[PDB]
Amino acid sequence: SMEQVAMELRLTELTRLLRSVLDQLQDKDPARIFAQPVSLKEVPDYLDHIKHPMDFATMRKRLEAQGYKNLHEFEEDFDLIIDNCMKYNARDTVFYRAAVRLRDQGGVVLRQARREVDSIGLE
Ligand SMILES: Cn1nc(C(F)(F)F)c(-c2ccccc2)c1N
């Protein structure tokens, strides 16, 4: 149907928006601390602590599969990346602090993303 092609155009343009957002976000992690899943080989008890791991590459595969229906779903995964990091690592540590910084940097990128989504009307 033509309505379905309409729906796909919107979802596609949401995806095109989220790609940009994600590309900006990973630029804010030049250490690439958050680029791949935390390694269970290197952190064997990680899953005893973190029930829902997330990382940028896992977000990008969902993105390109157009599995983000809206900006909220995308944000929730971003929050997992940040929050998981802040649970496992203590406040005085360089990991905890990177997540704080990425959360703050990221909040600006996401602030305008929420406005474009609303303005261009994609949900
Ligand atoms: C975002 N994040 N968080 C963690 C940690 F929670 F496991 F410390 C790690 C990690 C720490 C040591 C080895 C491998 C990965 C990363 N990359």
mmCIF file of C-alpha atoms and ligand atoms in Angstrom:
data_model
loop_
_atom_site.group_PDB
_atom_site.id
_atom_site.type_symbol
_atom_site.label_atom_id
_atom_site.label_comp_id
_atom_site.label_asym_id
_atom_site.label_seq_id
_atom_site.Cartn_x
_atom_site.Cartn_y
_atom_site.Cartn_z
ATOM 1 C CA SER A 1 0.000 0.000 0.000
ATOM 2 C CA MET A 2 0.953 3.660 -0.438
ATOM 3 C CA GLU A 3 0.327 4.267 3.262
ATOM 4 C CA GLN A 4 2.972 1.582 3.991
ATOM 5 C CA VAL A 5 5.493 3.350 1.712
ATOM 6 C CA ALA A 6 4.626 6.559 3.618
ATOM 7 C CA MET A 7 5.268 4.838 6.951
ATOM 8 C CA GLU A 8 8.563 3.509 5.622
ATOM 9 C CA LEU A 9 9.634 6.954 4.443
ATOM 10 C CA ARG A 10 9.123 8.293 7.976
ATOM 11 C CA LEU A 11 10.831 5.374 9.678
ATOM 12 C CA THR A 12 13.662 5.783 7.166
ATOM 13 C CA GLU A 13 14.001 9.459 7.962
ATOM 14 C CA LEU A 14 13.871 8.717 11.690
ATOM 15 C CA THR A 15 16.688 6.223 11.053
ATOM 16 C CA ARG A 16 18.594 8.826 9.061
ATOM 17 C CA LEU A 17 18.223 11.182 12.014
ATOM 18 C CA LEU A 18 19.305 8.579 14.589
ATOM 19 C CA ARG A 19 22.371 7.632 12.543
ATOM 20 C CA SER A 20 23.524 11.241 12.762
ATOM 21 C CA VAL A 21 22.831 11.330 16.463
ATOM 22 C CA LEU A 22 24.697 8.092 17.085
ATOM 23 C CA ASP A 23 27.604 9.284 14.948
ATOM 24 C CA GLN A 24 27.825 12.405 17.058
ATOM 25 C CA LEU A 25 27.658 10.386 20.259
ATOM 26 C CA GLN A 26 30.528 7.998 19.360
ATOM 27 C CA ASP A 27 32.604 11.063 18.448
ATOM 28 C CA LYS A 28 32.255 11.981 22.127
ATOM 29 C CA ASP A 29 33.911 8.695 23.100
ATOM 30 C CA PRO A 30 37.314 8.865 21.358
ATOM 31 C CA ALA A 31 38.663 6.319 23.876
ATOM 32 C CA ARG A 32 36.055 3.999 22.351
ATOM 33 C CA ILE A 33 35.214 2.863 25.869
ATOM 34 C CA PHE A 34 31.583 2.321 24.810
ATOM 35 C CA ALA A 35 32.067 1.140 21.216
ATOM 36 C CA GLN A 36 31.653 -2.632 21.686
ATOM 37 C CA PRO A 37 29.954 -4.896 24.231
ATOM 38 C CA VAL A 38 31.847 -5.215 27.510
ATOM 39 C CA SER A 39 33.909 -8.404 27.169
ATOM 40 C CA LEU A 40 32.681 -11.256 29.359
ATOM 41 C CA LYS A 41 36.091 -12.846 28.890
ATOM 42 C CA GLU A 42 37.768 -9.770 30.405
ATOM 43 C CA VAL A 43 34.974 -9.135 32.951
ATOM 44 C CA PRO A 44 33.627 -12.608 33.746
ATOM 45 C CA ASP A 45 31.132 -11.469 36.426
ATOM 46 C CA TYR A 46 29.752 -8.587 34.394
ATOM 47 C CA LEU A 47 26.396 -10.271 33.823
ATOM 48 C CA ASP A 48 26.029 -10.999 37.518
ATOM 49 C CA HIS A 49 25.894 -7.219 37.900
ATOM 50 C CA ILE A 50 24.397 -5.882 34.704
ATOM 51 C CA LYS A 51 21.131 -7.378 33.494
ATOM 52 C CA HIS A 52 20.918 -5.492 30.182
ATOM 53 C CA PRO A 53 24.263 -4.617 28.568
ATOM 54 C CA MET A 54 24.443 -2.063 25.798
ATOM 55 C CA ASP A 55 27.079 -0.462 23.618
ATOM 56 C CA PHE A 56 27.261 1.681 20.480
ATOM 57 C CA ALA A 57 27.825 -1.144 17.961
ATOM 58 C CA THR A 58 24.797 -2.991 19.246
ATOM 59 C CA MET A 59 22.798 0.223 18.897
ATOM 60 C CA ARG A 60 24.008 0.716 15.321
ATOM 61 C CA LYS A 61 22.958 -2.824 14.286
ATOM 62 C CA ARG A 62 19.498 -2.184 15.705
ATOM 63 C CA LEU A 63 19.456 1.213 14.008
ATOM 64 C CA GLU A 64 20.341 -0.097 10.556
ATOM 65 C CA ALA A 65 17.753 -2.842 10.992
ATOM 66 C CA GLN A 66 15.459 0.135 11.550
ATOM 67 C CA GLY A 67 14.487 -1.328 14.915
ATOM 68 C CA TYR A 68 14.146 2.059 16.610
ATOM 69 C CA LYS A 69 10.528 3.132 16.125
ATOM 70 C CA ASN A 70 10.975 6.433 17.934
ATOM 71 C CA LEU A 71 13.458 8.609 19.764
ATOM 72 C CA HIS A 72 12.480 7.216 23.166
ATOM 73 C CA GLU A 73 13.575 3.661 22.374
ATOM 74 C CA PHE A 74 16.949 5.003 21.204
ATOM 75 C CA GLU A 75 17.413 7.116 24.306
ATOM 76 C CA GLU A 76 16.622 4.148 26.577
ATOM 77 C CA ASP A 77 19.517 2.228 25.099
ATOM 78 C CA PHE A 78 21.794 5.251 25.442
ATOM 79 C CA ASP A 79 20.814 5.432 29.069
ATOM 80 C CA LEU A 80 21.657 1.730 29.511
ATOM 81 C CA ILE A 81 25.209 2.373 28.260
ATOM 82 C CA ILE A 82 25.623 5.231 30.725
ATOM 83 C CA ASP A 83 23.817 3.663 33.657
ATOM 84 C CA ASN A 84 25.432 0.251 33.341
ATOM 85 C CA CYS A 85 28.831 1.906 33.404
ATOM 86 C CA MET A 86 27.946 3.940 36.489
ATOM 87 C CA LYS A 87 26.703 0.898 38.423
ATOM 88 C CA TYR A 88 29.613 -1.424 37.846
ATOM 89 C CA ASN A 89 32.292 1.272 38.364
ATOM 90 C CA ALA A 90 32.753 3.367 41.541
ATOM 91 C CA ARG A 91 32.402 7.148 41.606
ATOM 92 C CA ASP A 92 36.113 7.992 41.824
ATOM 93 C CA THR A 93 37.069 5.893 38.782
ATOM 94 C CA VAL A 94 37.901 6.928 35.230
ATOM 95 C CA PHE A 95 35.161 4.672 33.784
ATOM 96 C CA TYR A 96 32.425 6.097 35.960
ATOM 97 C CA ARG A 97 33.552 9.616 35.113
ATOM 98 C CA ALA A 98 33.639 8.998 31.341
ATOM 99 C CA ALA A 99 29.993 7.864 31.501
ATOM 100 C CA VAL A 100 29.071 11.027 33.392
ATOM 101 C CA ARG A 101 30.791 13.116 30.726
ATOM 102 C CA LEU A 102 29.250 11.201 27.836
ATOM 103 C CA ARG A 103 25.829 11.636 29.498
ATOM 104 C CA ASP A 104 26.337 15.392 29.708
ATOM 105 C CA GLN A 105 27.827 15.820 26.198
ATOM 106 C CA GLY A 106 25.099 13.562 24.899
ATOM 107 C CA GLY A 107 22.269 15.480 26.527
ATOM 108 C CA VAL A 108 22.865 18.403 24.161
ATOM 109 C CA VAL A 109 22.841 16.246 21.054
ATOM 110 C CA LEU A 110 19.658 14.560 22.234
ATOM 111 C CA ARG A 111 18.006 17.850 23.192
ATOM 112 C CA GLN A 112 17.826 19.058 19.602
ATOM 113 C CA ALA A 113 17.173 15.591 18.227
ATOM 114 C CA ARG A 114 13.917 15.595 20.235
ATOM 115 C CA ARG A 115 12.948 18.884 18.642
ATOM 116 C CA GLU A 116 13.661 17.851 15.041
ATOM 117 C CA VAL A 117 11.721 14.612 15.518
ATOM 118 C CA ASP A 118 8.801 16.645 16.856
ATOM 119 C CA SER A 119 9.056 19.406 14.224
ATOM 120 C CA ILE A 120 9.531 17.105 11.226
ATOM 121 C CA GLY A 121 6.891 14.914 12.897
ATOM 122 C CA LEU A 122 8.193 11.333 12.877
ATOM 123 C CA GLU A 123 6.182 9.396 15.502
HETATM 124 C C1 LIG B 1 31.947 0.700 29.238
HETATM 125 N N1 LIG B 1 32.717 -0.281 29.973
HETATM 126 N N2 LIG B 1 32.439 -0.670 31.241
HETATM 127 C C2 LIG B 1 33.334 -1.581 31.622
HETATM 128 C C3 LIG B 1 33.302 -2.254 32.949
HETATM 129 F F1 LIG B 1 32.124 -1.985 33.509
HETATM 130 F F2 LIG B 1 33.393 -3.574 32.782
HETATM 131 F F3 LIG B 1 34.314 -1.866 33.712
HETATM 132 C C4 LIG B 1 34.223 -1.809 30.560
HETATM 133 C C5 LIG B 1 35.403 -2.701 30.506
HETATM 134 C C6 LIG B 1 36.330 -2.680 31.543
HETATM 135 C C7 LIG B 1 37.456 -3.486 31.516
HETATM 136 C C8 LIG B 1 37.655 -4.333 30.446
HETATM 137 C C9 LIG B 1 36.754 -4.361 29.407
HETATM 138 C C10 LIG B 1 35.635 -3.542 29.422
HETATM 139 C C11 LIG B 1 33.797 -0.968 29.538
HETATM 140 N N3 LIG B 1 34.410 -0.853 28.312
#
